[model samples]
Target chain A: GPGMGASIDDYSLVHKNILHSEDLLKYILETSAYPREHEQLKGLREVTEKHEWSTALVPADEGLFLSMLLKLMNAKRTIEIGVYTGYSLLTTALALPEDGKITAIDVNKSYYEIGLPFIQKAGVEHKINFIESEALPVLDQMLEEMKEEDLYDYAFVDADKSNYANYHERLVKLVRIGGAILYDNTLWYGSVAYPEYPGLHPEEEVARLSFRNLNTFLAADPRVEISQVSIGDGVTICRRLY
Target chain B: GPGMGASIDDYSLVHKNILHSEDLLKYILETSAYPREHEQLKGLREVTEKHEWSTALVPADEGLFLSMLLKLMNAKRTIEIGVYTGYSLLTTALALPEDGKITAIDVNKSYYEIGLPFIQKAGVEHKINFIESEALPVLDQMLEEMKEEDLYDYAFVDADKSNYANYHERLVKLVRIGGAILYDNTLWYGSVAYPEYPGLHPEEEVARLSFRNLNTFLAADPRVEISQVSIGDGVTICRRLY
Candidate 1:
């Protein structure tokens, strides 16, 4: 499904910015009464912004949505596949009740350390069990350990692009029948739609192919019902039925 | 808050259209395995396209999202404040269990009549209790009638823009503490972000103002968690939390 252009703006539908301008984004933030980022979060963002992979961090609006979803589901036991600067992980920690727990997994320890102080300052470190390794094996262990199915209420996948489908397959089994698994960046900067055009980096090119295949793969899986929403690089929410 | 229309080529964080292009939209339909449109849906689209208020109809992608929501909630009882040719109403009917119910409301019977046959043809007519009158009264009646506070599982508001806030006030009472209320066209053609800009029609202008005020109104209200997503004309999802 080659779209009109490989460029970010070229792929948008609303024309202007697809999302909106900074002023519009500002208006949305103000009008929504979204709170200012926690001081710790602000600190983490400042540090992450200086990193080369700053793009990996989830935006504020998307973070708000994640918080909302956790509350909507009243989620307690959750998992995060990618913990870049722990912005989303912090969001989940804040959203969950005091007794809630999150099994946060990431391949990089440095990035986790960058946001670790914030998580500690937020006083939610107890809620998160940080694991440094491949997410799939940990998921497998959990799958084997759970007494019954549906041990987790939610799972957020924002890690490796090439492994989205793999994560989804495992997530569907771990997440409760009615619980949701949110696949981040499923749109892959619109490259899934415009496959022919070259993305800025080779990694983005890999992401494009992986996510494009996932679009079809997840769609066909009858075990869950999905909604591909255009928010933060596009998030595809799949709620498992059986 | 007007955004400087910077070069689209420059600012995109993602590569492809954040939202789908016509070709991409088509591919989404195919890859997602979204079913073929109901014959009545096609009929209604034809008539609505000819009507002056064609914009009132929820697009297929948004319609699909609505359907997915219904199934995710396992929603049994739902309400619709605006019914334009019954496109979304039918979608709800199909998604819900056979015994599920939808209280569909609209002020214009003439417009609804155009799509009435399609609903009948789909044989989900029994699920709908179409009320041909102003929406406010019907909502009021439901608020009075429900013995329990949270009787309904879901609600969709797409009617008069002027009444969105009013609808929210009542819908919150009728919908359960965890139930969801979806406000359509919350973006109002992106005019909510840029109120000074002119819309194509006078009513659109009114809608822009009304929704803009609402964007702030709903955001400040603490009763519900909100997510203003860039779907069809922008959909603001409010999940009630008591």
Candidate 2:
């Protein structure tokens, strides 16, 4: 399956945020993100936090931001490129219309089990089609098989960094023009600015370098308009333009 | 009319940023925002940078983000509460359809003259109705006179903080449910995290405290779903849910 593996731990660490200070991160959390959390999302975050690879989860505010983006786009048909405990996938599911559907692909399904209960409780489970497979092949299938009219209205990518550009290549075709495709962790836990930081991991260095190239690639890509939002470990929203 | 005034200088000092470091801010500017800038927007930013109070202008990437949002929402009818140098206003005006119209309000018009050349160069001036008054009365008139069919699909606000909540009150009514109303400087130059930090200006103090309250207030407000994006002096995007 396609995933970030254990390459995302440093971001979920309580301190060392991308913001000026940890308090600022907390201020955003307490001030806006958590106050209006859906009951099921709250439960999912709580349960997922205890998982061994809990670091892979999306920030509540990022979840809130994604949900808002989905609704703002009035997005109906969407796709999720990664699903770790399904936090962001659930966020996407709940934001869409009753008939809206999301095809969520993940290499590992065990990790997704942790949030399945909450997703079921939220009753948006039917909106998601969980695929136990790596995303590239699935995306290739989607681009080739789906009719022009079935192109996704939006896409969320939180999988491995090495394949980000590949996903972008496929996703540009998979999503409609003027639609958005969000790539999570483009900041690589603030690694782009401070490359030689303290206590860096092997994957962090590798992923950071890939994200750097991907960032430049997305910036130069004329097919989309990009905004690298400094929210939730850095989610870059790219609106495909033709 | 209703605007941020010179209260925004501390943010544009080119040193202090909401991000971890100025290097990171520059990294984002160079990596994503500046690379895809509209030719006229690039000109507007270059010209606006020379203004005495140019600190009030929006970040190029923030301008890019606003452009993406307007296009993503397929927005036609929109409103802008503040129009400093018209960078954001131009961004909005260019992103909308040719027939799309935007009524922009600001207390000061002389400042707008700085970026007027680029707006005209881009040939988007026709989409804008530049008003030379404070925003409150204009908002009042629109809400009172406009029919529901004329409801705005989007709004951008970089106006006075004291009137932020006031504008939010009016904007929620002016923009239709599901449309977004953006409030700039909600974080107040990282003031929420480091309130007692050094060299604080008088307006910064007043605005920060007001924003501190407003953050909490917006968090609790049920009329909309909010995402406080930590981009360009902390923009909080609110999508009306009702």
Candidate 3:
């Protein structure tokens, strides 16, 4: 069978789905390679494969992105909700002033144990506050015990989905006005839509529902300027203002 | 009395391991970010937010990055393993040279039905061939029923984990020499590294083992040039060549 040619077949598809296709096309047209984008990324890519782990403990690309964000805001006091291997937390720490500090919270101690060595290897272990406890209560305790001055310059939440609301409530108080909060995994495996899994309420479904509710709440709330991006599982960011 | 700056406070708390503030300070250095470098990604952030039912699609950042890879490789024909909301499918369709076609496979018709209109709205509806069936049988049928000339220019995998190896084995044949295959959600959150959780039956452990095995297979496989990036969750890209 002399089936569809690549160029012709794709053209036909795009022709059929113009609006969505165009938006994607526009995205393609607008995006260019980052400086050393291919080579540098390939280097990190090698690291990911060699490690034999599904995720790179170090978020290589986001590392650069976060450091730049901190420099832009001149953030010195920051807090991270999920410290999985402390890659992103370390990235944040490397961006601050010599006397800067970051409070990193996580429920699991063993995970951070791996990252602890890396932080020490990088010689920045002095700048981080690693807390071993569930995030919600720790955040609450911070709100009650700490003053706004003692609060954080930024808050990053990347923990369990079931407690996002709890984390956010406390984060609002912990992060001062004009500060920011980076919410990770807002797009849970692209399952945020109403699930139609035919009688089976899977774990993914529950997580998706939680994310959907969280999205709705964040959208309606007017305390911050929200910037949602299609990063890792859809990272939603908010800049606080009173 | 104006509060004396925490000189006498938290001495006991510090000793009790309640808050490791000193460790927090060292974790704040080692950061990185350059907006100008990753400019191509800027648009991805906004596109992710504009879509209401984004879960019906893959996240936008991966979409944009994949689109560029397709363009770089001149991928006119492609296949997507999962087309939940068609975001990745939409992006692939739009990245082609006005005539690209995407064979998108999924088991659920209703879910694709929800995203179809939005894809139609995007106007790249025709660029996609949506197959609503279990991907395994369909892929098997693709190989058994279709001829050598009908192979795909590129194929992406993002479906059920248990069938990932099956998908890879079949897709290698479907994707021709010099073609590309992108595997999304390769990271599977941080679970792929965690050995065990209370209620979970070491599923992550199993996944990690599989991922490691696949990594070894890909590294040793001489038929392709493999690159894995810390993109969304994680993206492992394989460029095939005999």
The DockQ values of the predictions, listed in order, are 0.31, 0.75, 0.02
The superposed Cα distance between candidate 1 and the true structure at residue A52, in angstroms, equals: 2.6
DockQ, cand. 1? 0.31
Positional deviation of residue B54's Cα in model 3 after best superposition, in angstroms: 22
The residue-by-residue lDDT of candidate 2 on B39-101, one tens digit each, is: 999998888888766666788878888888888889999998889888899999989999999
Ten residues in sequence with the least summed lDDT for candidate 1 chain A: A1-10
RMSD of each: 7.1, 2.7, 23.0
Candidate 3 lDDT over A1-242, as tens digits, reads 00111222212111121112233222211221122123333343344344323232333434444554565456889998777666677777776788999988887776666556656766677998899887888887887799867878778787776668778877877887877787776655334533342332344455567876776676556786454443434556666657
State, as a TM-score between 0 and 1, how close model 3 is to the true structure. 0.43
| Residue ranges of candidate 1 with Cα displaced over 4 Å | A1-23, A36-47, B1-30, B33-52
Q: Model 2's chain B TM-score?
A: 0.92
lDDT of 2 by residue, A7-66 (tens): 344433334578888788788888888887899999999998887666667999899889
Query: How far out, in Å, is residue A87 in model 2?
Result: 0.8
Candidate 1, overall lDDT?
0.75
Cα error, candidate 3, residue A131 (Å):
0.8
Q: How do the predictions measure up, each by TM-score?
A: 0.85, 0.93, 0.43
Model 3: residue B8 alpha-carbon error in angstroms? 70
* Runs in model 3 lying further than 4 Å from the true structure: A1-58, A193-201, B1-242
Clashes of each: 6, 7, 46
- Docking class for model 1 is acceptable
lDDT of 3 by residue, B1-242 (tens): 00112232222111111111223111111001111112332343335445443332344445545665565455677888877655666667766777888888887665566556666666777888888888899888888987777778788887765457778888888997767777765544423333342333343345545664565565556676555444444566666666
Model 1, A1-242: lDDT tens digits are 11112443333222223353556556665565255456677677778877756666777777877887787667889999999789999989988999999999988877798899999999999999999887889989988888564388889998877778888878888998788899998766555666576424554566678888888777777898787766667788888888
Top candidate (DockQ) = 2
